[PDB]
Scaffold this motif. Structure first.
Motif, short mmCIF file in Angstrom:
data_model
loop_
_atom_site.label_atom_id
_atom_site.label_comp_id
_atom_site.label_asym_id
_atom_site.label_seq_id
_atom_site.Cartn_x
_atom_site.Cartn_y
_atom_site.Cartn_z
N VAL A 1 15.73 -18.96 125.14
CA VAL A 1 16.16 -19.23 123.76
C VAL A 1 15.53 -20.50 123.16
N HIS A 2 15.29 -21.51 123.98
CA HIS A 2 14.78 -22.80 123.50
C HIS A 2 13.26 -23.01 123.64
N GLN A 3 12.51 -21.95 123.97
CA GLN A 3 11.05 -22.03 124.08
C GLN A 3 10.37 -21.77 122.74
N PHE A 4 10.66 -22.65 121.77
CA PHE A 4 9.95 -22.67 120.50
C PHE A 4 8.54 -23.22 120.74
N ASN A 5 7.66 -23.02 119.78
CA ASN A 5 6.33 -23.60 119.86
C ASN A 5 6.18 -24.67 118.81
N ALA A 6 5.39 -25.67 119.13
CA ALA A 6 5.17 -26.84 118.26
C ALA A 6 4.60 -26.48 116.88
N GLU A 7 3.91 -25.34 116.80
CA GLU A 7 3.36 -24.85 115.55
C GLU A 7 4.47 -24.66 114.53
N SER A 8 5.62 -24.14 114.97
CA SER A 8 6.76 -23.95 114.07
C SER A 8 7.17 -25.21 113.33
N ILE A 9 7.13 -26.35 114.02
CA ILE A 9 7.40 -27.67 113.42
C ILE A 9 6.34 -28.04 112.38
N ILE B 1 15.76 -31.23 114.01
CA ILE B 1 16.56 -31.51 115.20
C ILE B 1 16.34 -30.38 116.18
N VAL B 2 16.02 -30.74 117.43
CA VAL B 2 15.77 -29.75 118.48
C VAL B 2 16.58 -30.10 119.74
N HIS B 3 16.83 -29.09 120.58
CA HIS B 3 17.61 -29.24 121.80
C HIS B 3 16.75 -29.92 122.86
N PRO B 4 17.35 -30.73 123.76
CA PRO B 4 16.59 -31.27 124.90
C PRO B 4 16.08 -30.21 125.88
N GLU B 5 16.65 -29.01 125.85
CA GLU B 5 16.14 -27.86 126.60
C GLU B 5 14.80 -27.33 126.11
N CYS B 6 14.36 -27.74 124.92
CA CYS B 6 13.07 -27.32 124.37
C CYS B 6 11.89 -27.93 125.13
N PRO B 7 10.69 -27.31 125.07
CA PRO B 7 9.56 -27.94 125.79
C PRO B 7 9.13 -29.27 125.15
N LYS B 8 8.57 -30.15 125.98
CA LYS B 8 8.16 -31.49 125.56
C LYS B 8 7.42 -31.56 124.21
N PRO B 9 6.38 -30.71 123.98
CA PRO B 9 5.71 -30.81 122.69
C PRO B 9 6.67 -30.66 121.52
N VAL B 10 7.68 -29.79 121.66
CA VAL B 10 8.62 -29.54 120.58
C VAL B 10 9.50 -30.77 120.38
N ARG B 11 9.97 -31.36 121.49
CA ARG B 11 10.79 -32.58 121.41
C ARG B 11 10.03 -33.71 120.71
N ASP B 12 8.79 -33.95 121.13
CA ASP B 12 7.98 -35.04 120.58
C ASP B 12 7.70 -34.94 119.07
N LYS B 13 7.68 -33.72 118.53
CA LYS B 13 7.44 -33.51 117.10
C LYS B 13 8.72 -33.44 116.25
N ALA B 14 9.89 -33.58 116.86
CA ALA B 14 11.14 -33.55 116.09
C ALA B 14 11.59 -34.95 115.73
N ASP B 15 12.36 -35.04 114.65
CA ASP B 15 12.98 -36.31 114.27
C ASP B 15 14.12 -36.65 115.25
N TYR B 16 14.85 -35.62 115.69
CA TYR B 16 15.97 -35.79 116.60
C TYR B 16 15.93 -34.79 117.75
N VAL B 17 16.35 -35.25 118.92
CA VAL B 17 16.59 -34.39 120.07
C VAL B 17 18.08 -34.50 120.38
#
Ligand SMILES: O=C(O)c1cccnc1C(=O)O
Ligand code: SF4
Ligand SMILES: [Cl-]
Length: 302
Positions: A174-182, A195-211
């Motif tokens: 469920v939390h395997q979004f791709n950084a392109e979406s951001i 805002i993204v979940h800490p369960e998301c992959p690192k690239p997604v976390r790094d591109k969010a304002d909040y984890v």
């Protein structure tokens, strides 16, 4: 039909003295008929405060078992006894025992999305919201962490501690979004906070304002004034958020649906209250054992 079902549910609930606890990932119809909606721990803790001794739990097995562990003398029923977490089920007692052997000085920190059987073998339980605080307060600078690799690596980053993840490649689909979406929402809503979940992959976390966990998500609009929030988690949170902040806009980063969370429907919920099944039963010795790392968690918190 839905009024039909809902009326009957609200009827049998009152008639048979059940409190309904729904997880944030439930379909909005089930969120609306619940007495409380929250994350895994929040629902178990709330259940500890209740005078009632009958609970209808709407989420997945491990969570209902968590409610039961912390509320042993309450009747806990779920509408679909097969609702489970496939990530959690990938971690095994054999794997735990193997890693304790290899790293005897590393405490076993177990994510709440884990089997109850696994909990009995853990040194401390944690949630997405407290994993960082929990690991920071342990004496050891190395921990064994499972079953989610992403959350584990996120915890490593934030604590600076060494985090040995188990099993291999434990992840939530469920939390395997791709950084392109951001990249895409940033162009579309230039003033939106992501805002993204800490369960998301690192690239997604790094591109969010909040984890943040779901519980943390729910609090960010209390301090961040932004009009628009892009939410990188399971779709059921969007309904929770809109309800708590009807004055803001909540956009899913992508459509992400947990199949197991969706196994609960109005129909099988109604059957659950009719038949007063399916009851969550654990062996007493499992309860006694799993309570240890959970109480250890409360102690560190606090
Ligand atoms: O603890 C939970 O309920 C939970 C379980 C799986 C994923 N996220 C959460 C969360 O609260 O953010
Ligand atoms: S949303 Fe992810 S972490 Fe939660 S039960 Fe489903 S697979 Fe497991
Ligand atoms: Cl009890």
């Amino acid at each position: 039909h839905h009024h039909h079902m809902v009326d009957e549910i609200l009827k049998l609930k009152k008639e048979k003295g059940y409190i309904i606890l729904a997880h944030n990932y439930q379909i909005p119809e089930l969120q609306d008929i619940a007495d409380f909606v929250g994350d895994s721990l929040q629902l178990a803790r709330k259940a500890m405060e209740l005078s009632e001794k009958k609970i209808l739990f709407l989420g997945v097995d491990f969570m209902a078992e968590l409610v039961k562990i912390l509320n042993p003398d309450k009747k806990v029923i779920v509408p679909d006894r097969s609702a489970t977490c496939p990530m959690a089920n990938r971690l095994t007692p054999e794997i735990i025992r193997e890693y304790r052997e290899k790293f005897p000085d590393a405490p076993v920190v177990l994510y709440v999305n884990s089997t109850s059987e696994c909990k009995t073998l853990a040194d401390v339980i944690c949630t997405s919201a407290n994993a960082v605080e929990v690991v920071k307060k342990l004496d050891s600078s190395v921990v064994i962490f499972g079953p989610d690799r992403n959350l584990g690596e996120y915890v490593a980053e934030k604590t600076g501690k060494k985090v040995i993840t188990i099993p291999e490649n434990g992840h939530c689909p469920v939390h395997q979004f791709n950084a392109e979406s951001i990249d895409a929402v940033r162009k579309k809503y230039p003033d939106a906070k992501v805002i993204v979940h800490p369960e998301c992959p690192k690239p997604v976390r790094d591109k969010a304002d909040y984890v943040g966990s779901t519980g943390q998500m729910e609090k960010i609009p209390e301090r961040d004034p932004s009009r628009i929030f892009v939410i990188g988690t399971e779709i059921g949170m969007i309904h929770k958020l809109k309800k708590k902040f009807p004055d803001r806009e909540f956009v899913p980063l992508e459509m992400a649906v947990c199949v197991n969370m969706k196994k609960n429907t109005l129909e099988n919920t109604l059957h659950a209250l009719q038949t007063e099944s399916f009851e969550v039963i654990l062996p007493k010795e499992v309860i006694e054992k799993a309570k240890k790392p959970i109480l250890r968690m409360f102690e560190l918190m606090g």
